């Protein structure tokens, strides 16, 4: 990235992200009709979209449960934001999976990440990331976990949910190429699951304890094997001050300043 | 009639520079001559006025001795002082002393201060500081900072504390409290008064000295205008005299100045032309003529050189320039000029000593520029260089070594070092406010010229003034007593009208016009209509200018309404304060700016938009981007971290970059740019604080967090991502930046050791200091405990524990925090409040209880944050989780009031019964109509929940009549929570039943011996829960208590409050009896409308049909409630501010009908009565509250003992408090009932035993001070409900009105808790022990299973299944309920066993013991008997026995009020016995002192005597307990002593 004025223009653009949060579209097609249904609370959805950014992709883990006497549906009741940095086509999450007392009761259901532009197909990077996560962690069930993509269409956010088929799981686990068009990536590796929004309950967030989540301005400090402890709070915005300590710290102190300064008494104080 | 004016046209554009005289006539010898490209006009040294034949300079020894000590080293007074000392010291009139600058006006001010000081002498001592306060209003901050020191030196002999007004509001108020002489600027005083910080000492402010009052002509003149106008007004209404001393320069319109100051032209007016100046000054004016500024500047330089060479070897020179850098520039330039011309030695001729002193001081100097200039006769003096260097320059000039000093007006203002010659160069200054180059101010010029001519050495000053030819006339008129003072009030009329409305001094256009009449604008407009846009036609049409004042007020109100600061109605011409207006008044922000904020701010703003909104403020409307600085502006744009949406070529972007640069601590180069930076920062402080207040009061969590962070960040001048240690200015920048480089979360350092942190930073030497500072950093620990109160409200108790070593030098007297309770998304605040942590109460827990609403989709959690108000990175957050929260079910609807026809008395059966109701009312109220068919014709248990004042006593009477019909030998027992109400009902039913139906009614007292006989004899037994329990505890033995036929309990809704558990246990025991004794003891319960009425009805056996629970809006007379928020954290300030709203509400709602005002404490009653009387007298409607005439008051006024009460009652208002005797209480009550007095101010504690009803009920400050915790505790909702229900006048009033003036914190709480029924919960668990020992001795409890069975009967069990969270339960499951019951019963039994009152065998069987027997017999607390048993030995005596009894635990409820400590200490030294380590806050030591005083039969205060009577009530039983325990132990001498 340019890192000189590109970030400034992107911050100016991202300041208006709360406008997108009222034109939301859901893709309801190709649904197999046999798998689970998923219900996402609009409060956490709006918070995620607001804290997101146009170009860089952000991602967060979903935790949820099934409502009593209705197991074929899953309500998403928590989102976890973890130390991460992402490019315009991938997100570099840490190896450590989230772990906390409150999360001990819910069941991981996958992850949700942004997309700078819409693509009618799940990307090879997304499928391989999900496959790697599932393989490394036995907790992720290949039938319950999904991936939710929020693509920034003109003045709107389009949400679509995808499930990983066993063929996709095997291909992702065996794969190593990180390019845009890896060999053996087929449209039979994933299938679309039914998701919908709901105003009838509220989810919450969980962020890291010691530091913040975003690392795009502190990438050199982001180690995939880094160990972090969770905390119950709300996430900051993408361009928050704490997320870019570089800009706010690299100034210089005052040495023999204010010497020739204008003499104006603070009469009121 | 009203007409809109054009204020911006009416104003004078030039402001301070505006002139009022079109001509300028000079003295005789005032020639002029055009020399070259400039005109020199000379004016000579006016000869002194010859001394009067009978006038001389009296020595200080002729002045009063109390005035001598203020004059140290002064043998004779100046001419003006010797002329007017008589008036300044021997009289208290308003003075207007017009004298030239430098003549010694401070000495006359000192004379007036000495007069005030000597008014109170403290003959045996020296002075009584705490009886008066004197204000010295000096315009310039440096002048104030010098005057404070000079006055301190002068009056140090008196011990008088002289100090300046500076710092935050709290710091300023504390300083005002501490000191006696307050030195301040007009703006500082005005802002403090607007915020109300000085309302506690306005009365003690007995004298104000307005120094250099001619500022009125200046653009700052409106500040003085409003200050004096408001002072004179308040003097007029409140009628307390404050002496005004206006010191002015000799200038025209001084007669108008005297009129405005209320200064008598004959006595209080004085005029001393420039002739009287102690050192006459020859004044030269060089007006440059050329029209090219470069040549103007060159000619200016040449002219200053010419004049310095003119006075080179003769006299010392003080050159005055504008800028700090310009001072050095001109000094060096003149040095080089005279060096080139070879005239450098004319200043430093071979004066070996002086020149060598100069050279050596140069070699020692650190400042390089001054070191360069000092070897020669030149020096510089500006505020931008070291204190040591500037004092060095000053003392060198005093020694007369430096021959020329170049400086700015700062020296002339803050230091009195006159010189023979003064030379003003240019008079040009860059004002960022006007954002351009403008001429010097009149005050500046007069002051800097006052330095011309040292009185000690110099006989004739020489003042040269180099200006523009066009500007010349202005300064000529200025210095030749020819520039009349003219008000600029038209410019700032709207803001000041808003400030007055906010203060409340003005309410409608009429009061606004009255206030405007007192403004200096009014007199000037009257005298010179043409100068103020008025025609002689308008003047003749309106001789008093009432029409013009009304038009001005109308236009100002129109603009205030357009900007929404005030809600103004053109119909009635009234004003209402809006939060925007209050913020504008508090922070002196223009109305256009507040409108801009109200229009721009939105909840979702980002930090990028925040800066733009701030920079769009109208206070910077003048500021504009000048392309000369645009390259540097672009550089700053690139450097600053926060993006800028706008382009660099916009003033908004300029302000944005300037503020970001100041925060970033960067260094700028342009003079104009850096001046603009300073200006914008100083304004931005207040602007950002105001924006923060707006967003907070509107409830936007994200935005308010941003804004508070930004205010703190501006104040500390550092970004919040930096290391917080920088906030300690003493820490080395090297180590702070090293820490910042080693970026880790700051909290990490807390857990580490000093060596550990030193090694982490790799700087062991500072490691210890870093440990010190990180431990000094403020830090709080939060602990939450929440209980659901209803389905839509929780109660959260939050405990705060400090974790930082307090230190005044860095923390101060107090640390302020904001507590914010916000929802799951942290986007809306649900409860925001202040929290002051004082040093006195540090390192100890603070309890903060509050109620927060809960909505339908139960959120997972709420967030409680505590954020420091000053410090950066000082926050603590806590998530409260609604994960295990069980919400109590939704209560059923209240029993609707069926529209039955009126019930005629003929519906009743017996003629004797009807007799006592026939004349009082032919029909009963609909409530009694509804309830009669069940109370009288049916025998089942009955409940009646109706609003207070609906006549539930009538239903009780119906129940008793039905019982009597059943049998004349039946017995009713009527239990009332409070003894006063018990006495009321005793009187009522003694007059009703016994005197007409010949039935016996007996009231039980605290004596079982007579209580048993009265129960056996009488037929209606009135009792209080404790007096009934002392009997029912032995119901198995007592057959009389068993054979009863009616149990009536009045107001069981008081079950949840204190002393409620006793009532609960007696009710449960009576139910259990009725169950066991073969005959249903019918029970009739009366209460206020209860939401959870079903629970109590089920507990009492009432049938669903027989539960009558109505709604608060079912009262026969409707109520109108009004809650007034008063967001004033400080309790005394809030109380005082409530004084005027009381009168306002009385006028608005109940102008002619009775009003009762409930006050928190015993002392406030008299003050509130006096204040209402004072405001009514200020209004023309004096004695308007005396519905009768004085003729009918003498017979009752002659019985009272309080002279103040007599005066108030004569004026038309009475009051009532515990201090008053019951006789006076009854007299005032009867007067109010008759209507002789409209207003009665009653103490809070008298709300219950109060036998009258009024039409209006005001309640002020629903909190009372508990000194045990040293905190203000809220009124119990039961007491508030009683006080509002007191507004029940059945026939006289169509409606009853009540207004509660409460903090915004309690506003919503009361709104929720007063319009709805009142859920009630039990507090039995905390007080089970006493009743449990009672039951075990009674043998009702024999095993723990029987204990659980007994618990199954109480109310607590009934609620333990509906609201489990209230009782620490986790589920309604039988398992959880059984576990909790077993735990609590086992805990209580184990505690009793440890106390040895009971014995537990097999861990399942329980038996009593001897100490428990004594405790149950004499009704003592088990812990009290325990303490008695352990502390009492065989050798104890009365001297220690009194201490033991005082330590008895029954007295722990004795009240501890404010101001109760000093008189208790005074008592402590006079009782025969001394107390060891006495903490007067302790109930036991207080009761010991009270018992000693009672034994000594010494005089006591009324409240102290009441507490003594309460003590003696139980002292007898405690001493019988002592006798019995000593008998059991077998100690003859201790028993004898007992």
Swiss-Prot record, chain A:
Disulfide bridge map: none
Tissues of expression: Widely expressed.
Segments for region (Required for interaction with EFTUD2 and SNRNP200): 235-269
Taxonomic superkingdom: Eukaryota
Domain MPN as annotated: residue spans: 37-168
Localization per Swiss-Prot or TrEMBL: Nucleus; Nucleus speckle
UniProt disease link: Retinitis pigmentosa 13: A retinal dystrophy belonging to the group of pigmentary retinopathies. Retinitis pigmentosa is characterized by retinal pigment deposits visible on fundus examination and primary loss of rod photoreceptor cells followed by secondary loss of cone photoreceptors. Patients typically have night vision blindness and loss of midperipheral visual field. As their condition progresses, they lose their far peripheral visual field and eventually central vision as well.
Record text on subunit structure and interactions: Part of the U5 snRNP complex. Component of the U4/U6-U5 tri-snRNP complex composed of the U4, U6 and U5 snRNAs and at least PRPF3, PRPF4, PRPF6, PRPF8, PRPF31, SNRNP200, TXNL4A, SNRNP40, DDX23, CD2BP2, PPIH, SNU13, EFTUD2, SART1 and USP39. Component of the U5.U4atac/U6atac snRNP complexes in U12-dependent spliceosomes. Within the minor spliceosome, which acts on U12-type introns, interacts with PPIL2 and RBM48. Core component of U2-type precatalytic, catalytic and postcatalytic spliceosomal complexes. Found in a mRNA splicing-dependent exon junction complex (EJC) with SRRM1.
Domain notes: The MPN (JAB/Mov34) domain mediates interaction with TSSC4 and SNRNP200. Has structural similarity with deubiquitinating enzymes, but lacks the residues that would bind the catalytic metal ion. Contains a region with structural similarity to reverse transcriptase, presenting the classical thumb, fingers and palm architecture, but lacks enzyme activity, since the essential metal-binding residues are not conserved.
Function summary: Plays a role in pre-mRNA splicing as core component of precatalytic, catalytic and postcatalytic spliceosomal complexes, both of the predominant U2-type spliceosome and the minor U12-type spliceosome. Functions as a scaffold that mediates the ordered assembly of spliceosomal proteins and snRNAs. Required for the assembly of the U4/U6-U5 tri-snRNP complex, a building block of the spliceosome. Functions as a scaffold that positions spliceosomal U2, U5 and U6 snRNAs at splice sites on pre-mRNA substrates, so that splicing can occur. Interacts with both the 5' and the 3' splice site.
Name listed for the protein in its UniProt record: Pre-mRNA-processing-splicing factor 8
Annotated organism of origin: Homo sapiens (Human)
Residues of the full protein shown: 2067 to 2335 of 2335
Swiss-Prot record, chain B:
Effect of mutating residue 1332 to L: In a colorectal cancer sample; somatic mutation
Documented effect of changing residue 683 to L: In RP33; strongly reduced RNA helicase activity
Domain SEC63 residues, every copy: 577-882
Subcellular localization(s) per the UniProt record: Nucleus
Source organism superkingdom: Eukaryota
Signal peptide per UniProt: none
Record's keyword annotation contains Repeat: yes
Domain Helicase C-terminal per the UniProt entry, residue ranges: 280-517, 1141-1349
Motif (DEIH box): 211-214
GO cellular component, one term: U5 snRNP
Keywords, sorted A to Z: Acetylation, ATP-binding, Coiled coil, Disease variant, Helicase, Hydrolase, Isopeptide bond, mRNA processing, mRNA splicing, Nucleotide-binding, Nucleus, Phosphoprotein, Repeat, Retinitis pigmentosa, Spliceosome, Ubl conjugation
GO molecular function: ATP binding; ATP hydrolysis activity; helicase activity; identical protein binding; RNA binding; RNA helicase activity
Post-translational modification N6-acetyllysine, affected residues: 567
GO BP: cis assembly of pre-catalytic spliceosome; mRNA splicing, via spliceosome; osteoblast differentiation; spliceosome conformational change to release U4 (or U4atac) and U1 (or U11)
Ranges where the record places region Interaction with TSSC4: 878-1538
Quaternary structure and interacting proteins, as annotated: Component of a core complex containing at least PRPF8, SNRNP200, EFTUD2 and SNRNP40. Component of the U5 snRNP and U4/U6-U5 tri-snRNP complexes, building blocks of the spliceosome. Component of the U4/U6-U5 tri-snRNP complex composed of the U4, U6 and U5 snRNAs and at least PRPF3, PRPF4, PRPF6, PRPF8, PRPF31, SNRNP200, TXNL4A, SNRNP40, DDX23, CD2BP2, PPIH, SNU13, EFTUD2, SART1 and USP39. Component of precatalytic, catalytic and postcatalytic spliceosomal complexes. Component of the minor spliceosome, which splices U12-type introns.
The protein's name in its UniProt record: U5 small nuclear ribonucleoprotein 200 kDa helicase
Organism: Homo sapiens
């Amino acid at each position: 990235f340019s890192s000189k004025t590109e970030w400034r223009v992107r911050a100016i653009s991202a300041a208006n992200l709360h406008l997108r949060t009222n034109h939301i579209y859901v893709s309801s097609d190709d649904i197999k009709e046999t798998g689970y249904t998923y219900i996402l609370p609009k409060n956490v959805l709006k918070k995620f979209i607001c804290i997101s950014d146009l170009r860089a992709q952000i991602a967060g883990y979903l935790y949820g449960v099934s409502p009593p006497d209705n197991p074929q549906v899953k309500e998403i009741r928590c989102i976890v934001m973890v130390p991460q940095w992402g490019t315009h086509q991938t997100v570099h999450l840490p190896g450590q999976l989230p772990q906390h007392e409150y999360l001990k009761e819910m069941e991981p259901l996958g992850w949700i990440h942004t997309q700078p532009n819409e693509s009618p197909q799940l990307s090879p990077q997304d499928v391989t990331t999900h496959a790697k996560i599932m393989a490394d962690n036995p907790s992720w069930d290949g039938e319950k976990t999904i991936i939710i993509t929020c693509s920034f269409t003109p003045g709107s956010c389009t949400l679509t949910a995808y499930k990983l088929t066993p063929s996709g799981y095997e291909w992702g686990r065996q794969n190593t190429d990180k390019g845009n068009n890896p060999k053996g990536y087929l449209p039979s590796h994933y299938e679309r699951v039914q998701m919908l929004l709901s105003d009838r309950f509220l989810g919450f967030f969980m962020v890291p304890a010691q530091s913040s989540w975003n690392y795009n301005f502190m990438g050199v400090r982001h180690d995939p094997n880094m160990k972090y402890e969770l905390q119950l709070a709300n996430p900051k915005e993408f361009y928050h001050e704490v997320h870019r300590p570089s800009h706010f710290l690299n100034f210089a102190l005052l040495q023999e300043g204010e010497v020739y300064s204008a003499d104006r008494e603070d009469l009121y104080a | 009639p009203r007409q809109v004016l054009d204020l911006e046209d009416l104003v004078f554009t030039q402001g301070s520079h505006f002139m009022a005289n079109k001509r300028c006539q000079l003295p005789d010898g005032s020639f002029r001559r055009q020399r070259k490209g400039y005109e020199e006009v000379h004016v000579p040294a006016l000869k002194p006025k010859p001394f009067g034949s009978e006038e001389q300079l009296l020595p200080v020894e002729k002045l009063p001795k109390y005035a001598q000590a203020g004059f140290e080293g002064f043998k004779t007074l100046n001419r003006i002082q010797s002329k007017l000392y008589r008036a300044a010291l021997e009289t208290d009139e308003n003075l207007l002393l017009c004298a030239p600058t430098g003549a010694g006006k401070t000495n006359v001010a000192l004379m007036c201060m000495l007069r005030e000081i000597g008014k109170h002498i403290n003959m045996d001592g020296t002075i009584n500081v705490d009886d008066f306060k004197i204000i010295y209003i000096a315009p310039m901050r440096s002048l104030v900072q010098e005057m404070v020191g000079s006055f301190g030196k002068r009056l140090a002999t008196y011990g008088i504390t002289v100090a300046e007004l500076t710092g935050d509001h709290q710091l300023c108020k504390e300083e005002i409290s501490a000191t006696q002489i307050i030195v301040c600027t007009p703006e500082k005083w005005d802002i403090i008064t607007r915020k109300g910080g000085e309302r506690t000492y306005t009365q003690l402010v007995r004298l104000i000295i307005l120094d250099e009052i001619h500022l009125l002509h200046d653009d700052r003149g409106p500040v003085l205008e409003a200050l004096v106008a408001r002072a004179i007004r308040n003097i007029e209404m409140t009628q307390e005299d404050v002496r005004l001393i206006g010191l002015s320069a000799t200038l025209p319109n001084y007669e108008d100045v005297a009129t405005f100051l209320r200064v008598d032209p004959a006595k209080g007016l004085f005029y001393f032309d420039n002739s009287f100046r102690p050192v006459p000054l020859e004044q030269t004016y060089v007006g440059i003529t050329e029209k090219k500024a470069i040549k103007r500047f060159q000619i200016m330089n040449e002219i200053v050189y010419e004049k310095i060479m003119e006075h080179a070897g003769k006299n010392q020179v003080l050159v005055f320039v504008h800028s700090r850098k310009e001072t050095g520039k001109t000094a060096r330039a003149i040095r080089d000029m005279c060096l080139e011309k070879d005239t450098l030695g004319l200043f430093l001729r071979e004066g070996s000593a002086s020149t060598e002193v100069l050279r050596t001081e140069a070699e020692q100097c650190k400042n390089l520029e001054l070191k360069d200039l000092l070897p020669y006769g030149f020096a510089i003096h500006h505020a931008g260089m070291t204190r040591v260097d500037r004092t060095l320059v000053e003392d060198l000039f005093a020694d007369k070594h430096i021959q020329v000093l170049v400086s700015t007006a700062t020296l002339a203002w803050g230091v009195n070092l006159p010189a023979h010659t003064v030379i003003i160069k240019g008079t040009q200054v860059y004002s960022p406010e006007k954002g351009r180059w403008t001429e010097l101010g009149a005050l500046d010029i007069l002051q800097m010229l006052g330095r011309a001519g040292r009185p000690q050495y110099d006989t004739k000053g020489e003042g040269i003034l180099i200006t523009s030819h066009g500007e010349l006339q202005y300064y000529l008129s200025l210095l030749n007593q020819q520039l009349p003072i003219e008000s600029q009030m038209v410019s700032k009329l709207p803001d000041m009208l808003n400030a007055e409305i906010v203060l409340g001094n003005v309410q409608n256009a009429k009061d606004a016009v009255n206030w405007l009449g007192y403004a200096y604008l009014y007199i000037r407009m009257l005298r010179s209509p043409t100068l103020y846009g008025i025609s002689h036609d308008d003047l003749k049409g309106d001789p008093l200018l009432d029409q013009r004042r009304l038009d001005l007020v109308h236009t100002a109100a129109l603009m205030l309404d357009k900007n929404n600061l005030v809600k103004y109605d053109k119909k009635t011409g009234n004003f209402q304060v809006t939060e925007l207006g209050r913020i504008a008044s508090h922070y002196y922000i223009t109305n256009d700016t507040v409108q801009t904020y109200n229009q721009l701010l939105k909840p979702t703003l980002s930090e990028i938009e925040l800066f733009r909104v701030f920079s769009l403020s109208s206070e910077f409307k003048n500021i504009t981007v000048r392309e000369e600085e645009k390259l540097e502006l672009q550089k700053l744009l690139e450097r600053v971290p926060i993006p800028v949406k706008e382009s660099i070529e916009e003033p908004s972007a300029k302000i944005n970059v300037l503020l970001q640069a100041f925060i970033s601590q960067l260094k700028l180069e342009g003079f104009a740019l850096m001046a603009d930076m300073v200006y914008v920062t100083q304004s931005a402080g207040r602007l950002m604080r105001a924006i923060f207040e707006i967003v907070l009061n509107r409830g936007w969590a994200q935005l308010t967090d941003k804004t508070l962070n930004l205010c703190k960040m501006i104040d500390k001048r550092m970004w919040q991502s930096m290391c917080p240690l920088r906030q300690f200015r003493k820490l080395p920048e090297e180590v702070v930046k090293k820490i910042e480089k080693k970026n880790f979360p700051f909290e990490r350092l807390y857990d580490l050791n000093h060596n550990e942190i030193g090694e982490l930073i790799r700087m062991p030497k500072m490691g210890k200091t870093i440990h010190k500072y990180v431990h000094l950093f403020p830090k709080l620990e939060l602990s939450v405990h929440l209980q659901p109160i209803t389905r839509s409200t929780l109660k959260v108790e939050l405990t705060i524990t400090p974790d930082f070593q307090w230190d005044e030098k860095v923390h101060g007297s107090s640390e302020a925090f904001w507590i914010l309770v916000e929802d799951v998304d942290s986007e809306v605040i649900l409860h925001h409040e202040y929290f002051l942590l004082k040093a006195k109460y540090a390192q100890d827990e603070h309890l903060i209880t509050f109620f927060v609403p809960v909505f339908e989709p139960l959120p997972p959690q709420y967030f409680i944050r505590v954020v420091s108000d000053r410090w950066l990175s000082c926050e603590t957050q806590l998530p409260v989780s609604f994960r295990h929260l069980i919400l109590p079910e939704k209560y059923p609807p209240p029993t609707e009031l069926l529209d039955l026809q009126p019930l005629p008395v003929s519906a009743l059966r017996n003629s004797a019964f009807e007799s006592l109701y026939q004349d009082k009312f032919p029909f009963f109220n609909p409530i009694q109509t509804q309830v009669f068919n069940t109370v009288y014709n049916s025998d089942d248990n009955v409940f009646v929940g109706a609003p207070t004042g609906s006549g539930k006593t009538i239903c009780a009477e119906f129940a008793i009549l039905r019982m009597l019909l059943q049998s004349s030998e039946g017995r009713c027992v009527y239990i009332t929570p409070m003894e006063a109400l018990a006495e009321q009902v005793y009187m009522d039913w003694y007059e009703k039943f016994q005197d007409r139906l010949n039935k016996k009614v007996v009231l039980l007292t605290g004596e079982t011996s007579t209580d048993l006989k009265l129960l056996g004899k009488g037929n209606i037994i009135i009792s209080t829960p404790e007096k009934w329990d002392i009997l029912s505890r032995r119901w198995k033995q007592r057959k009389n208590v068993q054979n009863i036929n009616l149990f009536v309990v009045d107001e069981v809704h008081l079950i949840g409050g204190e002393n409620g558990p006793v009532l609960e246990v007696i009710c449960s025991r009576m139910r259990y009896i009725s169950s066991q004794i073969e005959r249903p003891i019918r029970i009739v319960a009366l209460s206020s409308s209860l939401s959870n009425a079903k629970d109590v009805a089920h507990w009492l056996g009432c049938s669903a049909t027989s539960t009558f629970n109505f709604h608060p809006n079912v009262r026969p007379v409707p109520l109108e409630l009004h809650i007034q928020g008063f967001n004033i954290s400080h309790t005394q300030t809030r109380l005082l501010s409530m004084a005027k709203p009381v009168y306002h509400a009385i006028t608005k709602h109940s102008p002619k009908k009775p009003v009762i005002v409930f006050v928190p404490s015993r002392k406030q009653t008299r003050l509130t009565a006096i204040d209402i009387l004072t405001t009514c007298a200020a209004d023309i409607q004096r004695q308007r509250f005396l519905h009768c005439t004085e003729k009918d008051l003498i017979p009752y006024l002659e019985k009272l003992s309080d002279s103040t009460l007599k005066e108030t009652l004569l004026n038309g208002v009475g009051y009532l408090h515990e201090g008053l005797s019951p006789m006076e209480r009854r007299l005032v009550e009867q007067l109010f009932s008759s209507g002789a007095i409209q207003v009665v101010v009653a103490s809070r504690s008298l709300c219950w035993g109060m036998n009258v009803a009024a039409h209006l009920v005001i309640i002020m400050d629903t909190q009372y001070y508990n000194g045990k915790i040293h905190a203000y505790v809220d009124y119990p909702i039961y007491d508030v409900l009683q006080m509002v229900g007191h507004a029940n006048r059945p026939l006289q009033d169509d409606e009853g009105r009540c207004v509660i003036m409460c903090q915004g914190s309690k506003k919503d709480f009361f709104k929720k808790f007063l319009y709805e029924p009142l859920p009630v919960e039990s507090h039995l668990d905390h007080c089970m022990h006493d009743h449990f020992n009672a039951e075990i001795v009674t043998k009702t409890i024999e095993n723990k299973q029987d204990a659980v069975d007994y618990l199954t009967w109480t109310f607590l069990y009934r609620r333990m299944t509906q609201n489990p969270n209230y009782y620490n339960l986790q589920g309604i499951s039988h398992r959880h309920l059984s576990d909790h019951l077993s735990e609590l019963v086992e805990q209580t039994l184990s505690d009793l066993e440890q106390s040895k009152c009971i014995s537990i065998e097999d861990e399942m069987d329980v038996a009593p013991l001897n100490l428990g027997m004594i405790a149950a017999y004499y009704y003592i607390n088990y812990t009290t008997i325990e303490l008695f048993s352990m502390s009492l030995n065989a050798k104890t005596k009365v001297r220690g026995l009194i201490e033991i009894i005082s330590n008895a635990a029954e007295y722990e409820n004795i009240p501890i009020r404010h101001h109760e400590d000093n008189l208790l200490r005074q008592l402590a030294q006079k009782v025969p016995h001394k107390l060891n380590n006495p903490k007067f806050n302790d109930p036991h030591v207080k009761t010991n002192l009270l018992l000693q005083a009672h034994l000594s039969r010494m005089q006591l205060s009324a409240e102290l005597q009441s507490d003594t009577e309460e003590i003696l009530s139980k002292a007898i039983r405690l001493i019988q307990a002592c006798v019995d325990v000593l008998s059991s132990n077998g100690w003859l001498s201790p028993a004898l002593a007992a």
